[PDB]
Design an enzyme around this catalytic site. Structure first.
Site, mmCIF file in Angstrom:
data_model
loop_
_atom_site.group_PDB
_atom_site.id
_atom_site.type_symbol
_atom_site.label_atom_id
_atom_site.label_comp_id
_atom_site.label_asym_id
_atom_site.label_seq_id
_atom_site.Cartn_x
_atom_site.Cartn_y
_atom_site.Cartn_z
ATOM 1 N N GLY B 47 41.044 41.946 39.637
ATOM 2 C CA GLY B 47 39.697 42.502 39.554
ATOM 3 C C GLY B 47 39.487 43.402 38.350
ATOM 4 N N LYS B 48 38.365 44.140 38.345
ATOM 5 C CA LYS B 48 38.043 45.070 37.263
ATOM 6 C C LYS B 48 38.860 46.352 37.449
ATOM 7 C CE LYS B 48 33.539 43.089 36.213
ATOM 8 N NZ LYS B 48 32.061 43.215 36.322
ATOM 9 N N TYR B 49 39.859 46.544 36.555
ATOM 10 C CA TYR B 49 40.816 47.660 36.514
ATOM 11 C C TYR B 49 41.728 47.725 37.775
ATOM 12 C CZ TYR B 49 36.953 48.892 33.291
ATOM 13 O OH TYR B 49 35.944 48.857 32.360
ATOM 14 N N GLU B 51 44.771 45.049 40.217
ATOM 15 C CA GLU B 51 45.525 43.832 40.534
ATOM 16 C C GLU B 51 46.040 43.981 41.967
ATOM 17 O OE1 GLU B 51 48.631 42.822 37.626
ATOM 18 O OE2 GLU B 51 47.114 42.687 36.033
ATOM 19 N N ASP B 155 29.102 47.556 47.783
ATOM 20 C CA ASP B 155 29.618 46.324 47.138
ATOM 21 C C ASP B 155 29.873 45.236 48.202
ATOM 22 O OD1 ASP B 155 30.228 44.645 44.880
ATOM 23 O OD2 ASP B 155 32.283 45.407 44.727
#
Ligand SMILES: CCc1ccccc1-c1ccc(CNCCc2nc3cc(Cl)ccc3[nH]2)cc1Cl
Ligand SMILES: CCc1ccccc1-c1ccc(CNCCc2nc3cc(Cl)ccc3[nH]2)cc1Cl
Lengths: 324, 327
Positions: B47-49, B51, B155
């Site tokens: 993902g964004k920033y 793992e 989210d």
């Protein structure tokens, strides 16, 4: 030592899936305690505080037990057992499992019980009242034993009675365990005065019959007005106090039958004692509660050999209960 | 003189009445344990920033999930940890088991309870009307709980919902964008994933609340019962509002912005156009008719509304006739 197994409900857990009895693998979901408003403190125990509370969603009174989390595995065990027995006859009803948002302290929510004082009933209780309430405890024990569970802490403090409505509940399932044949259990269970011979001599392969010894201790104390019946001052002395009533002969017969190694601490304190008659405990103050049927029933409960004691189902069929 | 203020219809003052330690994540002290007790097995996702790895706890031989975070913003890591600690043990919330750092890298890492994800790319065509009702109710249990705890997830999407179909177990994951709800607070609108953003985010209305999660849930329901993934397929954040307007219509969009005195960005001038309000029944076809019913359409209509205050709360949603068939 020689192995042993229960005469009843021997294989009830062996025949169920692991989900029922493997408490360690059980997933507990903790709700939000904001739905309960604490009213007043009812009591304080070992790693627990009991409160009267109100459920703000339906305006109903409840009991909230806040647990000091000293052992997480033990909290999971109590929850799984309460969930399995939920709704059973005369078993305390677990209503919810919650945590306060700030403290995160584990808490159990139960059905409200409007109990009557034990030291208040004592002077007005009749022979029929004792027969009635003893039968109510037996309904709870035959049910939990049939569900493969041993309470392991049967005593007057763990029995709540609403005398006005003739309602009884067996509480505090914190020491309860699942029965598996051949399993060796911890002997550091139950309260001193109610501990069975098997616990005091360190015989680990015990069963549901432990609860029947405890029930016998309660009956003896009530019918004779002698609280506690077997008054030990430590765990070693507790065995000596039983030996003063049941005799030192049957204790050696018992340890030899199961090949139990007697702790050296018993050497200077056990002595030699004769087997006493139950009628010696009858006096002017208690005679209105004593009868041949009551004495025969008591004699079948308080026995050194766990296998020889009546089961909860056999006890329910005794002539002492013909009037209920 | 600026936009009209707004507040949540439920759990409005839950954080206001709690001590600062609960919600002041900046002041929270995080204790990082030793990652040596965990052996990494295989990579699950990227993902964004962050793992995500499958791992083994060497002390008890049990499988766990390890999320390694790229520390680009320290305040954000503190926020996620405090929220996970507050919700720990709640229904259908992923369980934080440990907080660790590798001795050499010193990279922040979160350890969670193991969840065995069923691949739904093939079982998507085997799902029944009952299965969708069942799992939607499970998500609602997680949302009513986190909202009652004063937290907005921000989210909600299929990627953040893990399902073990064999055991009928569901978990709401990735609390990295979650926030504490304080009435009257103006929040950043650059949250949620494009297809799941509520109209409040798209028109730059900052005083939003828990109801944002209910729009996102509605987008998931429509994509499932109509077999249309995603339901609102925007190509950018401005076009995303146009895709919503092609379904809900432009009349009700102007009523929403007028109610809250919202100033519509000039970028919407040449792309918004004029659109009629569509009937939900138009999206029914031969391939999805076995998942659609009058109860499903009434429930969807009550989630997918421009006005955030008019949407059902998670508790109100749990009482809808669509859930009369579930335990
Ligand atoms: C004639 C019933 C009987 C027959 C034989 C032997 C004993 C009894 C007997 C006597 C008294 C009691 C009542 N014991 C209440 C204990 C209790 N536990 C409590 C916990 C709290 Cl927090 C608050 C209040 C509580 N109160 C029960 C029986 Cl079975
Ligand atoms: C019938 C459930 C449902 C009802 C309505 C709308 C949508 C759904 C739905 C469908 C599928 C899924 C599956 N979601 C998995 C996403 C995922 N995230 C992952 C992260 C990793 Cl690291 C590794 C693997 C991962 N896998 C969920 C829902 Cl809610």
């Amino acid at each position: 030592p020689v192995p042993s197994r229960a005469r009843v409900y021997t294989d009830v857990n062996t025949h169920r899936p692991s989900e029922y009895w493997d408490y360690e693998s059980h997933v507990v979901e903790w709700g939000n305690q904001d739905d309960y408003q604490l009213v007043r403190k009812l009591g304080r125990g070992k790693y627990s505080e009991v409160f009267e509370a109100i459920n703000i969603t339906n305006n109903e009174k409840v009991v909230v037990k806040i647990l000091k989390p000293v052992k997480k595995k033990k909290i999971k065990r109590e929850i799984k057992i309460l969930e399995n027995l939920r709704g059973g006859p005369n078993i305390i009803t677990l209503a919810d499992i919650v945590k306060d948002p700030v403290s995160r302290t584990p808490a159990l929510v139960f059905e409200h019980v409007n109990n009557t004082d034990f030291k208040q009933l004592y002077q007005t209780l009749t022979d029929y009242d004792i027969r009635f309430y003893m039968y109510e405890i037996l309904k709870a024990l035959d049910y939990c034993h049939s569900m493969g569970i041993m309470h392991r802490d049967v005593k007057p403090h763990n029995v709540m009675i609403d005398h006005e409505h003739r309602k009884l509940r067996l509480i505090d399932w914190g020491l309860a365990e699942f029965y598996h044949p051949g399993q060796e259990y911890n002997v550091r269970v139950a309260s001193r005065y109610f501990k069975g011979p098997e616990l005091l001599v360190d015989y680990q392969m015990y069963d549901y019959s432990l609860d029947m010894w405890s029930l016998g201790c309660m009956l003896a104390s009530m019918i004779f007005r002698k609280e506690p019946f077997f008054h030990g001052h430590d765990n070693y002395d507790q065995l000596v106090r039983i030996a003063k009533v049941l005799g030192t002969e049957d204790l050696y017969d018992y340890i030899d039958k199961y090949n139990i190694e007697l702790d050296p601490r018993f050497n200077d304190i056990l002595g030699r004692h004769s087997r006493k008659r139950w009628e010696r405990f009858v006096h002017s103050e208690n005679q209105h509660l004593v009868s041949p049927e009551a004495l025969d029933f008591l004699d079948k409960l308080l026995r050194y050999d766990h296998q020889s004691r009546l089961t909860a189902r056999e006890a329910m069929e005794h002539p002492y209960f013909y009037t209920v």
